């Protein structure tokens, strides 16, 4: 529902006051997280198990910063090479340097809010920091981007979304999870949801495409299937979501249907 809209507006406000103009590159960062669906999944997933949220807002903010950091790096010139750019605005020079400042910005905003004392004892915190780092690490996303540097068509070779667009919401779910006290039984359970809800939004969208950025599915293979993977990811996701009992999980579902369509 619009609920999502509310969350997004709040995220935007904390971010602005997180990045202040002070000196120096700073001007450049703001024009990278300024100029769906990873962050919000997390707050709401976090709401589950019933945790005061101000506890998950920092995670959402860190998440958008992380998305942007590797965003800048994905439409850098030495990647796709075909058309305003966050890199061609301040120079490919500062562009690099910027995202390199955004990674530690997340982990810093995370440690600052995401109040450690009271709820969210630190071990949980390290787990969260590790999750975000892993999410953008060699294992996921960077591998996803690397895979997606052009070949493209494979039956199961074609699932780079799973690492490029998949393992970004995977943590975003798993992040929410640990924040409010999720059990391991619900650890991969909640995280299984993330992987396959990240693919959904992207996989659906590769019909019309300001976002993040080859190796698309439709071009790659029979649409009937593309259209077919959709239910297969809807159904799977729906299974994992259903695990949950003792609603409200009404909200955890609409995420699956918002995707179809904006």
């Amino acid at each position: 529902r619009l609920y999502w809209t509310s969350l997004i507006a709040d995220v935007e406000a904390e971010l602005d006051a997180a990045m202040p103009i002070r000196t120096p590159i700073h001007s450049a960062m703001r024009y990278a997280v300024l100029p769906r669906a990873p962050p919000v999944l997390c707050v709401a997933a976090c709401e589950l198990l019933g945790a005061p949220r101000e506890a998950a807002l920092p995670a959402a903010v860190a998440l958008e910063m992380l998305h942007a950091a590797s965003l800048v790096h994905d439409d850098l010139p030495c990647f796709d090479a075909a058309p305003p750019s966050t890199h061609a605005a301040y120079g490919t020079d500062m562009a690099v340097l910027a995202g390199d400042a955004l990674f530690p910005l997340a982990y810093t905003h995370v440690i600052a809010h995401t109040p450690s004392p009271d709820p969210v004892p630190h071990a949980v915190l390290l787990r969260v920091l590790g999750e975000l780092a892993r999410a953008v690490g060699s294992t996921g996303m960077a591998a996803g981007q690397f895979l997606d540097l052009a070949a493209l068509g494979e039956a199961e070779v074609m699932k780079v979304l799973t690492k490029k667009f998949g393992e970004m919401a995977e943590c975003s779910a798993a992040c929410g999870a640990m924040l409010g006290g999720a059990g391991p039984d619900e650890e991969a359970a909640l995280r299984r949801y993330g992987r396959t809800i990240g693919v959904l939004y992207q996989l659906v969208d590769d019909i019309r495409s300001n976002g993040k950025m080859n190796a698309s599915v439709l071009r790659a293979l029979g649409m009937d299937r593309a259209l077919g993977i959709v239910e297969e990811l809807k159904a799977q996701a729906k299974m994992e979501a259903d695990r949950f009992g003792d609603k409200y999980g009404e909200r955890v579902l609409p995420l699956y249907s918002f995707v179809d369509y904006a």
Binding site: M29, L76, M94, V96, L97, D100, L102, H122, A133, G137
Partner: protein
Amino acid sequence: FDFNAYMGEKAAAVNRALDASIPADEPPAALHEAMRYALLAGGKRVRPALCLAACAVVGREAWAMPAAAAVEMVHTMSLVHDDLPCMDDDDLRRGKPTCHVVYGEPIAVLTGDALLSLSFHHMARFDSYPPDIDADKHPARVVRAIGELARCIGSEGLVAGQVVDLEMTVPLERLEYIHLHKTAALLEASVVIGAILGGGSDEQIESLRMYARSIGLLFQVVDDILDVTKKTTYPKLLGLEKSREFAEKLLSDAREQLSGFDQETAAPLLHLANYIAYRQN
């Protein structure tokens, strides 16, 4: 006590930890190799060394080995990107072709990005840390060690440093500001998160911080001096032995910071700072 032997040993320890952190069997293999080609690429291993010695001077060195791996990864990311054509070029140094030479630009891009993460990853992971850790206070330490590490990397640390240089005759205040924030920042991180993972007092932590802040400048002032032997710089602005005078002061500055410690345990931090000064690289 023999310092060179000590360095040789810690360098090896750090190296082994580093090899251990990156399995070359996992699938984005070129990327993992690229990370290894970068990280494992020799080097003296000084930043990990400060972190470590900072832990024993204030606790024992295996407590802070994950962070010593982390800053050496953080630092590696600070070199994989520096070698890119978009920035500094200078494709080949040591005797190694730079990382963008072997794997191209974009792999070099993702290799720094994987490391940065890996460093924060490896530091947060409790799987990384030994068992003889005071389990209680130590988790809360790792949070602030990460956040001290994080504070010195971003917009308040190195990047500010990497950028002001990229601005392009230059005044002093701004010269020392660049150095204080492209080299001195990373060293502050190392010895503080080392002191933190040692469990040291704030007095101990801060004194070690301005310790590193001075040997930070000291590091790169010498680099601006050794250049003459065999870009706006320090001997240009002040005079040559006006820069050997300045250097001589910054050392002595850092030394009386270890006044509060016992030369016993700090002998590595001392021999370290001396090495940074009279190095003939």
